[PDB]
């Protein structure tokens, strides 16, 4: 609803370090839809416990490969456009 379905359903090619992060949570291809990139990023965040019960909508990614890719120590999962922009920086 923040991001149009057509944009979510577009095939993208992750840059190599984003691909490394996706491959770490079982993703086995060179290209994905934006929606699949976001799914695997979700799986990664939940696996590495980059969250906190005190602030349940904040990803805490400082000193993690995710924080290096996105250029921030933390971000809000409610800011979908800002998150898409951070992912576009990591697509070929
Ligand atoms: C626990 C916490 C921090 O409140 C969290 C942690 C958490 F991992 C997620 C979310 C929320 C969430 O809402 N999600 C979906 C999402 C958000 C933004 C955009 Cl634009 C799209 N998709 C996340 O995924 C959900 C899951 C999945 N899809 O498998 C793990 C189950 C999520 C995914 C990617 C990024 Cl970059 C951020 C959040």
Task: Please answer whether residues 66 and 83 qualify as being in contact, where contact means their C-beta atoms are separated by less than 8 angstroms.
Answer: no
Radius of gyration of the chain, Cα coordinates, nearest whole angstrom: 13
Which amino acid residue places its CA nearest to atom 15 of ligand 1?
42
Nearest ligand 1 atom, CA 56: 4
Nearest ligand 1 atom, CA 87: 36
Nearest ligand 1 atom, CA 39: 28
Annotated domain spans of the chain: 1-92
Provide the token pair at 67. 């924080």
Residue 75 three-state SS = strand
Provide the token pair at 58. 């904040």
Provide the token pair at 30. 């060179």
Quoted resolution (Å) = 2.0
Task: Please answer whether residues 70 and 62 qualify as being in contact, where contact means their C-beta atoms are separated by less than 8 angstroms.
Answer: no
For every residue of 9-74, DSSP letters joined together read T-EE-B-HHHHHHHHHTT---S-EEHHHHHHHHHHHHHHTT---TTSTTEEE-TTSHHHHHHTSSE
Q: How was this structure determined?
A: X-ray
Question: What is the CB neighbour count within 10 angstroms for residue 1?
Answer: 5
Distance 92 CA to ligand 1 centre (A): 22
């Amino acid at each position: 609803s923040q991001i149009p379905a057509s944009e979510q359903e577009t095939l993208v090619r992750p840059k190599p370090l984003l691909l490394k992060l996706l491959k770490s949570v079982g993703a086995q291809k060179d290209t994905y839809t934006m929606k699949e990139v976001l799914f695997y990023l979700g799986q990664y965040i939940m696996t590495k416990r980059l969250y906190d019960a005190a602030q349940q909508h904040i990803v805490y990614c400082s000193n993690d490969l995710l924080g290096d890719l996105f250029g921030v120590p933390s971000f809000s999962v409610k800011e979908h456009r800002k998150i898409y922009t951070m992912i576009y920086r990591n697509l070929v």
